[PDB]
């Protein structure tokens, strides 16, 4: 199988970091039998809330509040209810982690960084938003420590930042699952036999099928769905 089709083909050498990311992706796919599941979510309440408070948030705190912070929080709370999803396959046993440490993807133009928000369940939305802008700030300056990259127990990727509608991600070995949060799209939907216009978002979950099946994955996805759909001005506190 030839790897070249012209004399003018460009060869790009691969540094130690990039090669390690690639080896990680290969190991993950080889070791984990992935299955995938998708759920539609009404994010209108979240959109309305975020846009109501975003401007005064940036005035008061100095960093912006993204939709992502709310999604991290909703995932964190659902993981408290479902520890089987916060787990690791280890041959003859499944290890359920006591910490909810959410790996988030923040990619550069060249490569992909996956820092970890430790104990995400114990942080507020403001706290998560602070940490996101800090980690993105450190990824842009190349000042990202190994302590920032370690101890992740679950991964959430904001693929909607890249305009995707549906995606299937590779699980961050040795974790059990990865959730992709897709684009928020205005759609005509049906509510009580009427046609409404709502801000819909797909949640796309890849699972380690040795650990989990559709039943548990579905119950988990429903829990995140319910957490997102309950977001309004009265029900959700930023701190």
């Amino acid at each position: 199988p030839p790897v070249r089709s012209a004399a003018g083909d460009k060869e790009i050498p691969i540094n130690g970091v990039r090669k390690a990311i690639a080896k990680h992706m290969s190991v993950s796919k080889q070791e984990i039998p992935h299955a995938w599941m998708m759920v539609e979510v009404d994010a209108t309440g979240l959109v309305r809330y975020r846009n109501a408070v975003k401007d005064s948030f940036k005035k008061e705190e100095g960093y912006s509040l993204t939709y992502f912070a709310f999604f991290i929080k909703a995932v964190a709370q659902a993981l408290k209810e479902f520890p089987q999803l916060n787990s690791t396959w280890a041959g003859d046993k499944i290890i359920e982690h006591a910490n909810i440490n959410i790996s988030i993807a923040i990619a550069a133009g060249d490569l992909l960084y996956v820092p970890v928000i430790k104990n995400a369940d114990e942080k507020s939305i403001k706290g998560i938003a602070r940490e996101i802008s800090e980690l993105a700030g450190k990824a842009r300056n190349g000042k990202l420590s190994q302590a920032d990259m370690e101890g992740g127990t679950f991964t959430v990727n904001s693929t909607g930042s890249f305009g995707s509608v549906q995606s299937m991600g590779i699980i961050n070995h040795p974790q059990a699952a990865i959730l992709q949060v897709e684009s928020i799209v205005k759609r005509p939907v049906i509510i009580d036999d009427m046609i409404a216009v709502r801000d819909m978002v797909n949640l796309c979950l890849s699972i380690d099928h040795r650990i989990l099946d559709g039943l548990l994955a579905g119950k988990f996805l429903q829990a995140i769905k319910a957490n997102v759909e309950k977001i309004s001005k009265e029900n959700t506190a930023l701190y």
Copy 2:
């Protein structure tokens, strides 16, 4: 070789031989089979309306309930008779197409996952299929599920719509050739003859062994199931 623990208070749950077998099966299937995936949208409005018209008097007479799933199993079984290439097994030297249409169905209880088989499902009526569903699901909760029920499967159908899923990619039950996930039935605005209609739409999601099958056969097969489901009404469909 990476760390598997992140706290002293991490809980270790031992894996029994049954769950360990299921897990080894999932790994073998993924290693051995190059999966590719296809999806079609299906108007299940006729099926919903017909089922809801007859479900009440069915449970009164038969003693067991008629679900949406029974209709799908019947629609799949007929389409497997149309396309035996889907009802097959890779054997390196040759491909074996099976004459018997035996459909493995996924029934999960909590964490553990069972796959009992409905033998010769093309020859059974919707009534007969419904009977065997309630029988096998009854024995799955009781744990009185025999080995003979687990064996002989040539195709797998999973009712992922029970878990509220809208789209799914399943792992093929090796050494079978394909698996179908029947998703949730969802009311959707839809275009019929340039008009906006409210229909009961369902996704059918198929994983294929790409050593055996391509998009052409898979597309034809999915179209056959689609046509089988979309023709369901009071006049076209007999339960017995």
Copy 3:
């Protein structure tokens, strides 16, 4: 195996199957999808198709426009037009698009060479020629070689969404699904549009979602700008 049927696997059919297996083992696949408004494309193709077939002798399909849109986007994103080679990534100078033209029993994947330098007419011509060569068993070895990206017309089988296996050692495969009329929202109004999903599988050793997304956005913008006055066939 009582009334079972046995179909033997010849050397060609076995080679395809081995190639599928190797690809899935060597390449860690990830997948991404965007929806695109193909109304402008549909309207333009239908307005011009009949006078095209009369003048040229071969038909103009939707697929020719999609090849062109992908090829133009690959000029901006050479990282997708690439190959994993151990310690190096090789970006290819030629945009040679492998297309699936399955005729009858099995699957044929010939290659439209330098597709970025051909017109929509030229691409339509080449699809016709390659389909004719596949039907007549006349595909040369040169026709099968040199592919740098693959596009599959899964819409022809009525697929709405799809995940394809990458043609190793390429970096990515794009599946173009069915064009379906859909109720859609445009400036808070309900419109009816011709929507098509573009489904992309990538080698995650080479590419991530950020690059894949930008690429899909470029194809989206290329397709959605096709109109009655914008694009020329020649």
